């Protein structure tokens, strides 16, 4: 490994994603294959490319060293194996969705999805999301309200 | 930067020199300037580790011989014919 | 097993053991590497 001069970058970089981010998910990759990463990188791909991460770090000692910053709801995620996912642009989006759909294709556990932060809380798969731009679901709420 | 503590030699000659070397010390001498030469005795393992860096032979370096700081340059070294140890050093006064 | 006077590891799996007064070599992969009189 590297000394501190390097354990600091994995911090100053990874924590300015939290400081400058959008949504957070969860997942434990016990059996995390590489067809695994391959896929989810195309997903990050659709979800821009390299706007997304997953930098395995669940050393509390790392991606909690980014938490007493923001998201101290994660002192509780960080135990055991974890795969932290941050969003920069994009809706508070679909990121959420396929992690459940992925891991529900066996694709290993999902930490039961211990969940995360947009609010400041816990678990439950939501597509309360990428409807986003479904302001059309407030366009159809126009003419249909005007007519009916 | 190299700080070398040392002591003036109380004994000189083949007899003493050998004795010193049995006790992980080793003789060396400071000469140069317009003032007399000075018979030094140095701690071995120390100068060894120090002289491991190449700067030892380039940089000016300082010897604290009975509280003075003489400040000199390494002229010449005597290494053991077949061991990894030092026999003697010539220091030029700078 | 080979006997020899100099024994030494051969495979990365050869192991070296001091049983009784005698120095040995045990390989979990390759029987040819057993050694004694070490």
């Amino acid at each position: 490994m590297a000394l501190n001069l390097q354990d600091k970058q994995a911090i100053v970089a990874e924590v300015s994603e939290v400081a400058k981010g959008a949504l957070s998910a969860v997942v434990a990759d016990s059996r995390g294959v590489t067809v695994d990463k391959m896929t989810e990188l195309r997903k990050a791909g659709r979800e821009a490319g390299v706007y997304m991460r997953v930098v395995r770090n669940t050393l509390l000692r790392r991606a909690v060293e980014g938490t007493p910053f923001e998201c101290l709801k994660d002192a509780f995620v960080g135990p055991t194996l974890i795969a932290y996912s941050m969003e920069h642009p994009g809706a508070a989006a679909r990121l959420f969705k396929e992690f459940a759909k992925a891991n529900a294709k066996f694709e290993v556990k999902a930490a039961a999805f211990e969940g995360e932060l947009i609010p400041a809380s816990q678990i439950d798969r939501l597509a309360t999301l990428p409807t986003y731009e479904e302001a059309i679901a407030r366009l159809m709420a126009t003419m249909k309200e005007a007519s009916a | 930067m190299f700080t070398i503590n040392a002591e003036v030699r109380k004994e000189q000659g083949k007899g003493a020199s050998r004795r010193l070397r049995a006790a992980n010390k080793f003789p060396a001498i400071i000469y140069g300037g317009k003032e007399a030469p000075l018979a030094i005795e140095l701690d071995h393992d120390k100068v060894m580790n120090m002289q491991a860096k190449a700067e030892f032979y380039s940089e000016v370096l300082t010897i604290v011989v009975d509280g003075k700081e003489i400040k000199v340059k390494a002229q010449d070294v005597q290494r053991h014919p077949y061991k990894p140890k030092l026999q003697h050093i010539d220091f030029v006064r700078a | 097993m080979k006997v020899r006077a100099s024994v030494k590891k051969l495979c990365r799996n050869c192991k070296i053991v001091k049983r009784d007064g005698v120095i040995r070599v045990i390989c979990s992969a390759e029987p040819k590497h057993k050694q004694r009189q070490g």
Binding site: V35, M38, L41, G45, G49, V50, K105 | - | -
Partner: protein, 141 residues
């Protein structure tokens, strides 16, 4: 495909799917049907092009028949009909012999867009650097 089971790839040919000395039998003989790669392959052959290198995987269990898959061409080979020289040395690579087309290497690599990890299609280029410094043949960039 979320589960591999059987795959042997031995670059075939399009214009007539009916070999015998190169592959022929050895392409289908363990629950595989020699009768159906001339019924099925050529059904996915003529839409594109014919004659040149075709690695391939098939869907044969022990289920009599099957269904054929397609693939992609080798990448240092697109430096033959897609560069110049067709060997790679002549003076063993103690000598840096070859010679490149910088324009090519991107769009000629890009032709292999469907089988690479780089997000940045420029990245997919940077891979072809070493794939094309495979001898030490410098590119006139």
């Amino acid at each position: 495909a979320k589960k591999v089971q059987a795959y042997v790839k031995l670059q075939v040919a399009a214009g007539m799917a009916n070999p015998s000395p190169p592959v022929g039998p050895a392409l289908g003989q363990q629950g595989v049907n020699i009768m159906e790669f001339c019924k099925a392959f050529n059904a996915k052959t003529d839409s594109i092009e014919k004659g040149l290198p075709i690695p391939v995987v098939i869907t044969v269990y022990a289920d009599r028949s099957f269904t054929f898959v397609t693939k992609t061409p080798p990448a240092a080979v697109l430096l033959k009909k897609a560069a110049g020289i067709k060997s790679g040395s002549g003076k063993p690579n103690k000598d840096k012999v070859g010679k490149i087309s910088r324009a090519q290497l991107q769009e000629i690599a890009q032709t292999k867009a469907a089988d690479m990890t780089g997000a940045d299609i420029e990245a997919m280029t940077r891979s072809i650097e070493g794939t094309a410094r495979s001898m030490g043949l410098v590119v006139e960039d």
